Design a protein around this ligand. Structure first.
Ligand SMILES: O=C(O)[C@@]1(O)C[C@@H](O)[C@@H](O)[C@@H]([C@H](O)CO)O1
Ligand SMILES: O=C(O)[C@@]1(O)C[C@@H](O)[C@@H](O)[C@@H]([C@H](O)CO)O1
Ligand SMILES: [Mg+2]
Ligand SMILES: [Mg+2]
Ligand SMILES: [Mg+2]
Ligand SMILES: [Mg+2]
Lengths: 175, 175, 175, 173
């Protein structure tokens, strides 16, 4: 009931859950980035994405695992990042993340148990509570950590998404 | 005599001080930001803010805790940040922080004991000496750390403000 | 046998491989860079390089070791980075790293055993497997690390390239 | 044998620090963490620490001159100097001894009256000559054993503030 991965051992329950995943949902801030928003004196805004996560996302997409993003902010740079990686299911300016989640379930003809969610803060928990595989990144808010099925060894924006992508592909044979 | 929080145990005295807080005063550099200034050849000036802190701030503002910012310089990026966060008490170009402190206290009909202040350097101290709850961020200057009522576990720009918000709400039964 | 370096002891086999190196091939992402891509709302893209790496590369170039870059996509910033350091052998937009590798060896009339390659992800392996000295940076993908002849103590974008330059120069009596 | 807020320092380091009339700083890896942000439009950024700034401002208002000798050339460094009130700036310096010499004559001081905070081997020719040589915590490995003092704080994280704090303590400020 416990299997070796290149990040350390995971339980067979987590691995069984990962095998059923058809949709991976991600936060942006704190998951794809480290949480920082860079702001300038005339409208300049930057975010830092991890390139190893991008390969993870590319691999998932070419391996029949849809990737969606549900974020509370609206930013063209996020639209650019998604468009460069081939992510189409982008949801911006979402206060209540449950709406987009239900939308995704219907559009993909998919059940909550076929969904994985990678989050870092308590606003993600209403959705995380419902999905097949809930994941907190290593440096998520302290109260979210014990609530997840799986906690990543790698921090948000440092390869946390790559780790999850690696896990899904290992569980589904496709690695 | 001490209580559990999600960041670690705190003393009863710190909790008793946090229960009484009606105003949270924050610095920009080293508290909301990572303490760095990102400068370019086009004259760009960027500061990095953390997504973890803003959720905390919005929760505080909706839970009858006013949030103010007192800062020594004048920057549009700081104006832009407050607008986004819902902060209407912004004091820029403040050499003498006690002036802003007195203004705040008369403007909100509040006593010094109802005020919390999060700082990171020695310039913060004259105000911190007056407040009900003085807070130093984890990576504050070594000489400020021992003077503060509370030292956060999280460093500036990494969610230290969130920690303080989490603390105040917990103490006031709104976490 | 083993030998002291300023980063820690190295095996005589690694030192022996480093003695024959006439060409150092470097990745951009996660090797020369911190592995991040900084993106902006109005189309900005930035990558962070490290000053410790630059001095090493120029020492290498002036000490009979060519330095080359093979990379996935075309970017002005990387072109600019190569001009500053004096790297003339730059392959951009290379989907197949093996083709660039072949052209590189034929252009410089060098045998694969006289080549070192520094990587951070699994895509680098096909080329790293053919060279005389394979190097993985300290924070490379966990599956790449055990395969490499040498794993740097220093993380990509923090002086890992300098560490490798220092090794090659040490092995050849030039540090 | 002497306590500071960053930890114990030797009386020897403190004596050297008492005599300092000029603090020379590297930019890359001392005032910043060594990273150079470069973009597709030719943007170049660097990250400075604000706490270092206050330290620098205290040094200048406390009869200690502050100078910058750097191998790179950038307007952003000029901008940072103007903010801090640093007037002695030497950019594009392949050989740091030439700027060093210039400072000695302009300020009418001796090498023993100088402190140098460095991060890499290029700094050693100058560091070898000064009264107080300083390596930042995360400087090049070979540089560290050579300096009179090694900071607890890493470059771009407050190492300069620590040196300024040390100089002011030694000179009774
Ligand atoms: O970082 C934050 O404090 C904040 O609440 C500020 C908002 O501008 C926005 O960045 C918000 C995001 O919705 C989180 O991704 O975070
Ligand atoms: O950061 C470097 O690798 C580099 O070599 C880049 C060069 O442009 C030059 O600025 C150099 C300086 O000598 C270090 O500040 O650093
Ligand atoms: Mg988040
Ligand atoms: Mg401050
Ligand atoms: Mg790479
Ligand atoms: Mg340097």
């Amino acid at each position: 009931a416990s299997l070796a991965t290149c990040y350390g051992p995971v339980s067979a329950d987590v691995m069984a859950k990962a095998e059923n995943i058809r949709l991976l949902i991600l936060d942006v801030d704190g998951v794809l980035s480290d949480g920082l928003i860079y702001m300038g004196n005339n409208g300049e805004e930057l975010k830092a994405f991890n390139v190893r996560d991008g390969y993870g996302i590319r691999c998932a997409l070419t391996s029949d695992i849809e990737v969606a993003i549900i974020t509370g902010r609206k930013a063209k740079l996020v639209e650019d990042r998604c468009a460069t990686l081939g992510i189409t299911h982008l949801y911006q300016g979402q206060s209540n993340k449950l709406i987009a989640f239900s939308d995704l379930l219907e559009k993909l003809a998919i059940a909550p148990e076929n969904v994985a969610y990678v989050g870092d803060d308590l606003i993600d928990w209403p959705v995380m509570e419902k999905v097949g595989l809930s994941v907190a990144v290593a440096d998520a808010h302290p109260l979210l950590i014990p609530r997840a099925d799986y906690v990543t060894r790698i921090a948000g924006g440092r390869g946390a998404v790559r780790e999850v992508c690696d896990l899904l592909l290992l569980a589904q044979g496709k690695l």
